[model samples]
Target: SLINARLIAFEDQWVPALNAPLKQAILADSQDAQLAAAMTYSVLAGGKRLRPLLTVATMQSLGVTFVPERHWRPVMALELLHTYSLIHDDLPAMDNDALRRGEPTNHVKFGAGMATLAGDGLLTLAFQWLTATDLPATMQAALVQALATAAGPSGMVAGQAKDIQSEHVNLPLSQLRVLHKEKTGALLHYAVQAGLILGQAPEAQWPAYLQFADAFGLAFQIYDDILDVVSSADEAKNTYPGKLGLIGANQALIDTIHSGQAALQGLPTSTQRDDLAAFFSYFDTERVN
Candidate 1:
């Protein structure tokens, strides 16, 4: 997978650096100790750290050095945002899932109120990591603005709202596309674009990179939907397949994978780029049962 390869590429450099902020975000003192512990437990749960991995991989693919002072902020930002989403997605009002990554969901283990707070904490902290620290004022402001647009009312949150509201309402393909593009695609877009911006990638490359990110995001979610349907009983969890029929959903995965790969056609290639491509290939096509 892209995540496994990404971790390997920056294992020694970025992973350790990334962990520090994650640790600090959860481990710092809180007046409400239970909430803090719940936040820590949820955020630290082992899984593929795909968002931050994408950020780092994109930076490395673009020939940017993984400088701690410069790159770590955006890398950490992506992860916190991701974790926050997971926490809320498992909430009682959302998917209402009881388990995540083979562990009890935060709201199941912690109270729902605390779970909500924990998710909120992580989401806000992501921007705090970006704006409050080391980067130049201009870069910090620009990143903050970009991330706010991606994760805020107009972006991922809106998508999630639509998703929850549409649970019983059959949606057209276009509506489903809009929902997933914002809910899933926005953050992935933010991760890749943030990396490009921070890496100082040329202006001409931004559009292509955004296309690649969107394609990858849609493909990832479509495969996730397929896996939920075909996966073993124990493996069935939060997925799109329960909503979209298997055959149609599988076709969507293939179409999105092609879209993602096509976006990469004329871009530069490196080990990191190849690894990302290979990762997506495996993700969209792999049999997980």
Candidate 2:
């Protein structure tokens, strides 16, 4: 109950904190009203905001105590990139997802061309927002590099390409991990990395944090795959359940959770640790809610 309460409080605190900057990034600017509106439509559409939350949570855990207002620019950059990825991924040539966050996807609502442009706009705008922060030039550069590396060809985009190719073909476990590590994990890795940078936490603590981020990435994907099986009634893709079967997939999820928790054991106790514990527990069926 306490964990749930903390998780709720954490979400409540950060989710709304993110809104104004997110809105201002794309919506407040006006060059081509249609483009601005399309970008705003998707950015404003709500989701869990977990990636940006990871940044703030990591800062808090690292003893930053309170997130400074200027930091919101770089923090919200993660979401801007994430939202762009989703916009592109949901296009007809990609995931073809008609709905996102319970409404028509950007493409479905605005047509593919505008949606594609909106995604491109967001992608470029993310880097711009990163620099908009008051952090030192070195810090700003680090943030930009991290986000770009995570979302670029070597990271999320690469994973996405591989994922598209692996459709209807079962990928070996090694290849599957690589694909997901890039596709899903890269951005998540960036989420935590941003937190580490913004919080000015010890670089020495990175190994354990990296381990936790990797494990959390896999755990999140495996859990999402499980939900697709249980809730979507849809055909399987290159998912853990598809590769390992339901029982095996569930086992994999548990093991992944254990791996993440083990990494957490390396951290000194803080609100970040507690927040992450609560966040990670969401993957465990019994612990969630």
Candidate 3:
């Protein structure tokens, strides 16, 4: 379908563009070369770049045809912040993850001390990029506020704390969803809103846009849990499959995709609408009866 092709085209064009500048900025910092190396290694280690992809795709769908050079700084901030979170998540005090994205986790490659600083570097640099952007002062402030709210103690951090607390315990379905909505959905929500701000989406449309983001975020986590279940990964952690059963969680994944798609239906149509339609499909797992 055109959906898959469209998203691939977007990825083919944007992923490299996003990756290069991220590494270059770390290199340019050029102080404490070892810390810079840790930051560079972790940033480049690789993931789908989904958060930044969502930001750019949302902007494109909102009729932002020409890339606004000024917006790139803030958009890239999403990736920086996301990468920082991943680094912290892998820390010994947190998930204690020894592996990530098919390689040693940051703390394993670099010492835990250096990895911690690398994460700190990326987190602070994310805000620096936001402030350095050419967006109007008000716009800059709005972005900073939104991002800080999403990433700070009341947002992802709170979620992470809850996540650690909930480990080894079976939380009810509703509680688990809330935990994930905060831990995972907060950043996804921020990603889309970042685009809305840059694209200058109508204030009236904000609710519908955010609804799409919420469903998209929920679906994303459900699909991730489903994958982990199938691969026999992290059996002890709370997961959709652990709570809902594989069949029920699979159904939940489908339901969330449908909900996310329905959210998009309320918006005016665009090429990126089709791209996002495909975006939801990316989470769909193959099923054979």
Candidate 4:
């Protein structure tokens, strides 16, 4: 699978660069040892690091080398934001989930107070990493601002708020699109944008990247929903299929995939770019659980 191969390629080179700085950041301060431990635990537990991979991959596609000093900061920023969202998502006030990726959720392993602090720590730490890094000041500022806008009230946070409130509201398709676009799509957009910004792509090329990000982000969620319903008992959760129904959800998945593919049309292709496209396709077709 292209996604698998791409991930393998990244694991061989990019993951180490992306992770080292984040590891150091988590251990940099030991003030609140418990909370620090919990935050470090959560951050290091190891997922695909897909968001940062997307960021680096996008940059690679645009002809930038995957050097640590040049790209690691923004890559780490993406992971920090992702981990922060996971910490909060596991809280009682949010998803209330007790497990993640087969381990105790942050809130379950640590007390709710610590969990809250941990999430806050990650969120703030993300920007701090960007600002304090040694990158060009202009690049640092742009990355920080782009990430903040994506994670703040107008982006992921706002979308999540809408999601929690809209569960029983029987939202129309348009509104549902808005909600996911904000909650999940925003971050994915940032993933692509951060890469372009790091690569110093001109303004004219950004809209196309954004178009691809939007389509891929939605498709990713649509497939997630479909997997929730179609996968094993270990996988049953509130998915798009649960809300949109199976057939409709499947159609939505296809539509988003097509849209994502269309968005990539006319862009330059490389192993990295083609691999990303393949990753999206695999995500669209893979069975989850």
Model 3: per-residue Cα lDDT over 1-289, one tens digit each:
1237777788898888877677767778658889888888888888899998898888888888535368777888888889999999999998899987778999998899999999999999899888885678888898999999999888888889888887777788888878888899999999999988888899988888899999989988888887776764333457887877788888898888888888888988877788866678677555311
Candidate 4 CA-lDDT value: 0.77
lDDT of 4 at 114: 91
Candidate 3, residue 126: Cα displacement in angstroms equals 0.6
Candidate with the larger lDDT of 1 and 4: 4
Residue 218 lDDT, candidate 4, scale 0-100: 85
Worst 10 residues of 1 by lDDT: 233-242
RMSD of 3: 2.0
lDDT of 2 by residue, 239-286 (tens): 788888788888898888888888988988776688876777667553
What's the lDDT of the predicted structure labeled candidate 1?
A: 0.75
TM-score of candidate 3 against the unseen true structure = 0.94
Whole-model lDDT values for every prediction: 0.75, 0.83, 0.83, 0.77
Clashes of each: 0, 0, 0, 0
Error of 2 at 121 (Å): 0.4
Give the total clashing residue pairs for model 4.
0
Which tens-of-lDDT digit does each residue in 57-160 have in candidate 4?
A: 78877888766665666578678879989889889988799887668988888889999999998888788767765678988889888999999999999998
- Identify the runs in model 4 with alpha carbons over 4 angstroms from their true place: 1-7, 233-239, 284-289
Worst 10 residues of 2 by lDDT: 280-289
